[model samples]
Target: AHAFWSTQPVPQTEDETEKIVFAGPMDEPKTVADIPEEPYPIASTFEWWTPNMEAADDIHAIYELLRDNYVEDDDSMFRFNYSEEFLQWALCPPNYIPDWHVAVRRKADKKLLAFIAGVPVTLRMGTPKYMKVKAQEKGEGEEAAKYDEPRHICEINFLCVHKQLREKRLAPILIKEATRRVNRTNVWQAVYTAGVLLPTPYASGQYFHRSLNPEKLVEIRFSGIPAQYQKFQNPMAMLKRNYQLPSAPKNSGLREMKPSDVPQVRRILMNYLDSFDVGPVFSDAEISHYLLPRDGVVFTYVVENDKKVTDFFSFYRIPSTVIGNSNYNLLNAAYVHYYAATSIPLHQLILDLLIVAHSRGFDVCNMVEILDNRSFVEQLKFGAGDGHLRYYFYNWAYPKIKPSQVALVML
Candidate 1:
């Protein structure tokens, strides 16, 4: 798809004073005539930076920036806190490299002000290959239909603006530049953000703090409903349809994923991930560690045909306490994480497995689902509503990509 706002620069309204004077890849910095001055305690100048592909030294600045300035809050991008080693492992891969972008606005004296960092990624949702074809067929005139083969999708994975500089329109500036960088290829179709909905009070009652385009906002039902869900309660019933799953496949199989299958599984995941706009570029070692076996819940599944593995699934049970006075067998919760499957009934198998955990006395079998993964979300709502939970995707896109928007239903 062509850049959404590439042709027209991000508009500055009366409320926004600082104009985006310069933007480009890190290696090619352009000089501005007179750096715009900031009025507020230099709330912080937003500077966008990327690693240099040729020099190892470039890695130092990004790492130090993250170490010195990055803060971990519930709403922070990549919500979980990162250890020094974990951070290195997660960001060291070549694909993860150079692509990392950060915005740093310096003070008038050139001191560090505020900073935002993000990277592009490719993501694969295991929607069947055939279903994607059907959607492409129906989407003949739409940009999403152009790609016929469905292996993975491009998403803008991690993004964050300095808390102080947030509403200043710096996000769209970085996003537009990232779009220009990613659109240089044919692999990526869309961009996505996954996290808690922004706390913003609006008449429409959408979860996000702001809307990129109110008319096109897309919202999906997360299993564990959070406070943000209340915002869009009027159309609550209608939103249910957005998360339903398709009919089950005629035949499918699931088994413990073996060590030998790592390469194949990584490749399969790469098709869905590994783009400039979607996710943190992960390495083989990182993927292996992430999918490694654990006590009870953490493990990978091999979904296969008569002879070959076609898809895989990953899930883990992290430790957590049952929240406040619950008369309903208040015990431990089997929280699920990274539960993803390939382009078939992998979700079905995972649900079936969840039943085993539930029967074995686990109070609740909870998992995180991207709000954009509509079909899976629909299945969870329709099939696992009793003890299920929900979360929201808080981003500027929520209002623009309305619940009824066509892209909301893509597998």
Candidate 2:
């Protein structure tokens, strides 16, 4: 079914999972010297360009391409509307490589036709205790053999092609070019997510949404009230009232995370993420880059009691354009990011988060049924979304992971 995927180094669809012996790279290891010296060839009228986020022109071009061409719901009700500020924050993290922001453009008019970006991350996999013991016996360094250790990898995202050119097979080329760029950096493995099923998936999770603007959602066909409630004359109004949140946070100790809280927050996040079988191991700098609040781009809150940090939760802003909606043009949405709770109940922590998200003017709060989120999703009245995001690995292989065992959230 996936001709392009079949040619890639990823595991084949026909491969039997039960017969697998071990987990590792699917392709043989290669050095930078083995990679191509130049970018992949394109049609004579098209050229590859590395977009500079610092330049407003380049940012707007990429934004327009994505705003009109990015992922949309099955019913085409909404499409991701990533703002320029959010794109800059997501694409330019600490130690980010500029070459990874690959874009294709027309030579005649320099029109951007497609784009795919890769951001560096340290992917960690939980290894069995027996494997750890065996590696230690073979005189491998503890840090090298430990399952908790991290390996540098790239996260590929935002692969999009101009709507008019879908049949030209631009997606595969974009993906291959991004893979080539990562390979040149000596990073062979990569991670990505797709709403559709491919050859294989490392983990898969369902999206759950907590509506803050229930009336707008129902009017726009984003969601609807339950059938039992629909029997009422004002079902939509009742849904809006039921989903309404408190004006203030329920947790008094919770407040916006500050720069001073980086150290403690970093430690708390690492410790919390370690529990998952598949997750990223963030460095101190990465913690600052990703978790520190950016006005409209990202929001993070930390819980403090008696002048000590207790827990932290973060969510990023990614509004969607409400296609064909006459009354509403946009749907302000908040996607849950990495979060940890050590001193408060998980449900309580999320309840406060939903309250804050509501107060912040978000239309909905979306999260995946991964990590410990299951503890609060049902209790908080978050409805299951039809969408399911599948996590994939490029040039690497691992055993299938359950949703509860996943801790990674990609933007």
Strongest candidate by lDDT: 2
Return the TM-score for each candidate structure: 0.40, 0.94
**Residue 55 lDDT in model 1?**
51
| lDDT, candidate 2, 1-411, per-residue tens | 677988998877636543333356779889999999788878899999999976888899999999999999878989999999999999999999999999999999998899999999988864534444555776754643433557899998899999988978888888888888888889998889989888788778999999988888888888767898877898877887788788998886899999999999999988988777788888789999999999899999999989999898999999999998899999999998988889989888888888888898898999888889888877789888888989888876666667888888989
* Model 1 C-alpha lDDT per residue in residues 222-302, reported as the tens digit of each score: 123345556775544444343322333223666667767667777866655432121333457656656655444355566
Candidate 1 off by > 4 Å: 1-46, 51-94, 105-146, 150-154, 180-190, 194-259, 263-312, 316-411
Report the lDDT of model 1 for residue 120.
34
On a 0 to 1 TM-score scale, where does candidate 2 land against the true structure? Answer: 0.94
